[PDB]
């Protein structure tokens, strides 16, 4: 793991230090606080707030009832079609490890050592330069492994 960031302040917005070529890993460790409604990891084209930066990959756990993960893409401030994963491995009051692997045609996401979902590229991964983490979550560390 390279360019490791420890105990960032949330919301975190930071520049990904190298290109997201296939085989690249983003490793995020943290825990979900007890009153958590949702949080999100956003892979962004830039960090502009107005107009809001495009989000190539929105990864968004929600914690109401059984919960879900919602994945989507924001282009010119418009959300596309949602892809919802109902079998969530996140729970309130539990620690997690998210590993996002970038492949040629999609992201693959594993949580706590177990494959969770695939998400097909809607924007070219070469446009992504910014990692954003927002909402009710505590991040212990963020690390990269570049191919
Ligand atoms: C129809 O709810 C929207 O769903 C979106 C996901 O497609 C996204 O999760 C939005 O969350 C917040 C408001 C955001 O990051 O803009 C939410 O309001």
Curated annotation (Swiss-Prot):
Positions of a carbohydrate binding: 62, 72, 82
Residue(s) at site: Critical for binding to sialylated and sulfated oligosaccharides: 52
Annotated Galectin domain residues: 12-145
Tissue specificity remark: Ubiquitous. Selective expression by prostate carcinomas versus normal prostate and benign prostatic hypertrophy.
Localization: Cytoplasmic vesicle; Cytoplasm, Cytosol
Domain comment as written in the entry: Contains two homologous but distinct carbohydrate-binding domains.
Summary of subunit composition and partner proteins: Homodimer. Interacts with CALCOCO2/NDP52. Interacts with PDPN; the interaction is glycosylation-dependent; may participate in connection of the lymphatic endothelium to the surrounding extracellular matrix.
Function field: Beta-galactoside-binding lectin that acts as a sensor of membrane damage caused by infection and restricts the proliferation of infecting pathogens by targeting them for autophagy. Detects membrane rupture by binding beta-galactoside ligands located on the lumenal side of the endosome membrane; these ligands becoming exposed to the cytoplasm following rupture. Restricts infection by initiating autophagy via interaction with CALCOCO2/NDP52. Required to restrict infection of bacterial invasion such as S.typhimurium. Also required to restrict infection of Picornaviridae viruses.
Name this polypeptide is given: Galectin-8
Species assigned in the record: Homo sapiens (Human)
Taxonomic placement: Eukaryota, Metazoa, Chordata, Craniata, Vertebrata
Shown segment, full-protein numbering: 8 to 154 of 317
């Amino acid at each position: 793991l390279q360019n490791i960031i420890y105990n960032p302040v949330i919301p975190f917005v930071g520049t990904i230090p190298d290109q997201l070529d296939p085989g690249t890993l983003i490793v995020i460790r943290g825990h979900v606080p007890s009153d958590a409604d949702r949080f999100q990891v956003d892979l962004q084209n830039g960090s502009s707030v107005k107009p809001r930066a495009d989000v190539a990959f929105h990864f968004n756990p929600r914690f109401k009832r059984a919960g879900c993960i919602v994945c989507n893409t924001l282009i010119n401030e418009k959300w596309g079609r949602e892809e919802i994963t109902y079998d969530t491995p996140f729970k309130r009051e539990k620690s997690f490890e998210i590993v996002i692997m970038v492949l040629k045609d999609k992201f693959q996401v594993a949580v706590n050592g177990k494959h969770t979902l695939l998400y097909g590229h809607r924007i070219g991964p070469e446009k992504i330069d910014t990692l954003g983490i927002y909402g009710k979550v505590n991040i212990h560390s963020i690390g990269f492994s570049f191919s």
